[PDB]
Each structure stands twice: as structure tokens, then as C-alpha cells.
Amino acid sequence: SVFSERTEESSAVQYFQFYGYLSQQQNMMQDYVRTGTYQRAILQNHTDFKDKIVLDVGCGSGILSFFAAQAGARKIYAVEASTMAQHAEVLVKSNNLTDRIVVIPGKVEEVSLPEQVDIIISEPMGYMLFNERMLESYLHAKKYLKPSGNMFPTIGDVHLAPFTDEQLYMEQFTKANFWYQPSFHGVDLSALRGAAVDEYFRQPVVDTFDIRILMAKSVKYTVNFLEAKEGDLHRIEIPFKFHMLHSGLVHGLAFWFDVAFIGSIMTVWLSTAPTEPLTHWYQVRCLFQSPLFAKAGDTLSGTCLLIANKRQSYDISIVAQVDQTGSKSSNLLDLKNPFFRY
Amino acid sequence: SVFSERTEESSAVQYFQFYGYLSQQQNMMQDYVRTGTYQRAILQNHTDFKDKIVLDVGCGSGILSFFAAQAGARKIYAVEASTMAQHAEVLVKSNNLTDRIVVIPGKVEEVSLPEQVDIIISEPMGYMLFNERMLESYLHAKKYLKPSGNMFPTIGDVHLAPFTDEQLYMEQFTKANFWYQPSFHGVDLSALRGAAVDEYFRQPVVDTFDIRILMAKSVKYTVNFLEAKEGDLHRIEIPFKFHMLHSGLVHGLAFWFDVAFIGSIMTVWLSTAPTEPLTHWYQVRCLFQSPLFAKAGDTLSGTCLLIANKRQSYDISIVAQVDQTGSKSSNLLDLKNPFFRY
């Protein structure tokens, strides 16, 4: 299938095993910003669901399908590849919604549905939006979408901004500097110091931070899920040009994302911005190996390039330069090995 | 090979990927009890190494091979299956030991060595001693050991003891009671509460604890690595009869381990007991489904059975009874999915 071809089997096994646990579902459900915002998006846009046919891609415990049912959906096909499908079916029966929610076990790339749908709902966002490559499954599922069907979420905005955080930078350097020792119990480790530095700086940092570390306004990169094709997410090129509002050392780029549910009644936003209440996505920072000095009024330009890999993640290439001086930093990150600093 | 036959490929891939990271090597190296005790065992037993041929099973960064070299080994074959083998080779060259340490990339069950060895060194201990099933690779490697060759570590003692920890026990139901809610955003979750409870009780708890929770002296189960065969570790039956030193509710069994390096000059011990400084192995606790009341002077008897599985771990079956009352409890736990409580 399209899934098996893009995904190493060992990655897939671990991925679906992880989502089989009720404790993982509980952690996500307890994010009230997440769960309450999805419910609001769906219920306040009840006319997008009333008497409609719905596909829930990767339904987990089924929560979004229950919201679609609360909003009056006629039929909801709830697709789920992990063993969580079993638990979803238990809830459908115990909530007396067997006439409206049909659990379909399997990958959305592999199952057969009996009809086309009016609207697709999912929660395909990982860290930095793109981690886990579930957006591809979501876009793949548009093979079931009627012409002029809707997608909830409809669009995703990735925000990037330069930050300064000397303490974060030094933390990672301090860890890597372990490998500088010429006599660790009599052993010279120093030949590996470069490799150690590279490894640590390849880890995106997942946590939150004070917005005062940001040195310019964010650049926004928008993916429209009604228009995007699955293949568009194999290679994602994000150019940026920041007008620096503060002078200082730029230690990296910070990332967050917003999704919008563009319904017939209203647009509801779920934001993971550092100006908004914290969610379980936090925010993500990619450190530069060497910071770049810029003055207020300078321009920091470059590219963030995300290349999808077979471990359901992305290799991230970030190249940035201060236009006025030619000072450049170039860095490679492995979005599958984040450092959870919170 | 013997490895591939006992190990699912997806488990192996994840396992060796994990050990490929320098940050994981650093975490282990920074455990001073671990690293200092290995160095002491080797250096203080220098006659077991001087001008000897050594095999280092699963050498990682190579640190134990460097200690063997410090002690005067003539030739050290250092086997390692992860990409850490590359980093080990870099250290062998930068420490000017290419005449003495030969890094052999691959599984010890699959590579060829050119000669028999005088002594095998390894660090094959996981959580509860047996997790990761690396002891089997260690025992497998005795095909290369000369008659009367030594093994460092030489023996391993697993300790089990009954504990009382009312708060730990109650925490399982508190977490599972998330599901015991008739209207979570309008959805009745209650039918999943039993499945949630079962899931949490299947997870052994990795953390440390105050020794005052222990209700009896530990029972010790000893594996002699000079005598044990690989096959002895497929099913590990640990009968126990605890003479209760305190009266109270027994919520489960706590586990830790010691290994001894029985050298010609001295025996050096590495302990992970809760009476000793904390190591990166912590300790492990397995809950009973129901607590058992016992009085000081009673006997708590039963069996801990560890059955090796193809995810490089064990299914743990614990059955226990208070002999004087006939009160019985059981649990089945999955050592591959521990709860890291810290």
C-alpha cells in the first residue's frame, strides 16, 4: 500500500503499538485545550455534520466521531489501525451509537469504505506539525471525499521565529563536552567530541518558553489540506526572511503551529503558539551549532527543508544567514529523536 | 543465527538503534558505581588479564576493553552489533591501541573469532537483571572460552522481596478512574475502566524507594555464568518463601540484582540494591492485583516465573499466598513495557 511503501516495518510496529495503550489516549484526552477546541470546532459548525457522512482518520478512542455524532452526523466511518479500534467499538456500543459510528479496523491506505464522505475529520498533527507523517494519511483519505467535501482541520500554519536562549545553548554544549575528556578513567574520549556535538544538536528541543526570547516576528508557512496532495509532504521547503527586531545572538529557530477548522458557521482555531495556553504539542526549537550575531534592523534569511524519511519523521535541514554580514549557520536535525526538556 | 531465531526483527532494530546513540553511552558511563566498579574489578584482578586474550561482548564505546588493556591484556576482541562499533574503532585508533583491541562489528552469535579466549567481559545486565536478554549472548559467547577460562561478571544474584506501598497501589486506580466518567465532553467512558486498570497493572514499575517499604528479607536467585547454558534463561523459575518481618498489606514484589567479578586476586561486587547508591538500573516493582495481609512471623510463598519472549524481554508471572491464611494473589506483567516512575 501507500503506507507500507513509505514506512519501515519496525517503525510502523512501534508506532501502532504506542497508540494501542489506553494511558496514551488518556494523556491526549486530558489536554483540555485540544479536546475542547475540537469539540467547539465540530459542535459550533453543526451544519457541516448534520445528516452528513463523515470519515474519521485515525480515530483512536473515537472521541471526534462522538463529537460528529453529537453534531448530528448520519454516518461516521471511524478508521483506526492500532488495537485501540477494539476499545473504540466498546465505547460506540456502550454509548448506544452503533447506528451512527462504524469502526473500520486498518490503515486508511488499505481499507475499503462503502461510500464517499461529505467531511473528513482527524488529528494528524505531530510536533512541528509534520512529525509522525500522519498528514499524508489524512490527505490520502481525500480519495473518499466527495467533490466540495470539507476537511477538519482545513489548514495548518507553521510559524517559525529566531530566538536567543544562551542557557539552552550551553546545556546542550555542556552535555556534548563530556566527550572532550582526554582521560575519562584513563581513556581519551576526545576524538568523538565532534560526533557527540552533532548528535546533541540534531535533537529538536520540545518545551515551552517566554515569548521574550523571540527576536523577530514569525514567518508563516501554510498548508491547505483541501488542496495539498500526499506527495507534497515528502519534501517541504520553507524559505524565510526575518526582519530582526532585537540585537543579540540568535541560537536557533522556534517552531509552533496553528490549525483552522473553516466551517460554514465559523472558523475555529487550535493554536500551539507560545502566546496561547500550553498544549501537549508544546513548541519546538532547533538550535544552531554556532549562534549568529544580528543587530536590530538586520535581515536573517534562509531555508528550512524537511525531507520525509521512512521512520515516520523528517530530516530537517536549516540554513540561515545574516544578510548584512554573510554570517551563516547550517544545521541538520532528526525530528524522530527530540529532547523533551519540559 | 541463534540471535535472529529468538528475536523479532522489529525489536532488534529498535534495540540496536537505541544503543547507537552517544548520549546513551554517556548516561551509562556517568553512572560512577557502574563504571568505577568495572574498572576496579578488572584492574585489581590484573593477573586475570596480563598477557591474556579477552572477548568483550557488546563493547559499546569500548570502555571495558580499554580497562582490559590497562590491565595488560595481549589481545582483546571487542564485539558490537550497533553502529556504536564505528565510534569504538575511532577510540581504539585515537588511544593508540590498534595492536591490542580488535573491534568486530556484528552480533556475537554471528561473527567469527580467530581464536579462543582466556576471559570474557561484558555488561549484559538489564532491568531486573534479565531484561533485554543480553545474558544469553554472554553465555552464547562461551563457545569461544578456553576450558577453565573466566567470566567477568562471574555470577548474578537476583533479589526479590515483598513490599508495602499503599500510594503506589492506589495510583493505578486513580489513573484508571479517568475512564470512570459518564460524560467526558458528552461521552460515557466508563466501559473502558477495567481495561485501563488491567493495562496499568501489567507494567512493572521502574524507580527507587525507601527500604522501609520492604516487609521481609530478600530471596536470592543465583545464576552462575561459568556453568549456565543459554537455554537456562528461556524459563526462569524463582520459588520464594518469605519470612515476614513486618505486619501489613503486601502490594507486590520488588526486584534488584548484584553481580560478582570473582577474580584470582579478589571478588568485586556491583550491587543495585536499594540499600546502595542509586544506579541507572534503579529497582523494579511488580504489583499484585490484590494486596495480601500478612503478620510478622507469617510466610509468603509462591513463584515468580519469567518466560522469555521474542521482544528481547520476559513475560513475568507472579503467584503468591500467605501460608497461614490461604490468601492468594497473582499478576502477569510485561517487562518490555515498564512504567518509568522515577
Ligand SMILES: N=C(N)NCCCCCN(CC[C@H](N)C(=O)O)C[C@H]1O[C@@H](n2cnc3c(N)ncnc32)[C@H](O)[C@@H]1O
Ligand atoms: N505529538 C503528540 N504527543 N501527540 C500527537 C497527537 C496525534 C494523535 C492522532 N491520532 C489520534 C487522534 C484521534 N482523534 C483521537 O482522539 O485519539 C492517532 C491515531 O491515528 C492512528 N493512525 C495514524 N495513522 C493511521 C493510518 N494511516 N490509518 C489508520 N489509523 C492511523 C494511530 O493508530 C493513532 O490511534
Ligand SMILES: N=C(N)NCCCCCN(CC[C@H](N)C(=O)O)C[C@H]1O[C@@H](n2cnc3c(N)ncnc32)[C@H](O)[C@@H]1O
Ligand atoms: N539499563 C539499560 N537500559 N541497560 C543496561 C546496560 C546494558 C549494557 C550496555 N552495552 C554494554 C556496555 C559496554 N560494556 C560499554 O562499556 O559501553 C550493551 C551493548 O551490547 C550490545 N549488544 C547487545 N547484544 C549484542 C549482541 N548479540 N552482539 C553484539 N553486541 C550486543 C549493545 O548493542 C550494546 O552496545
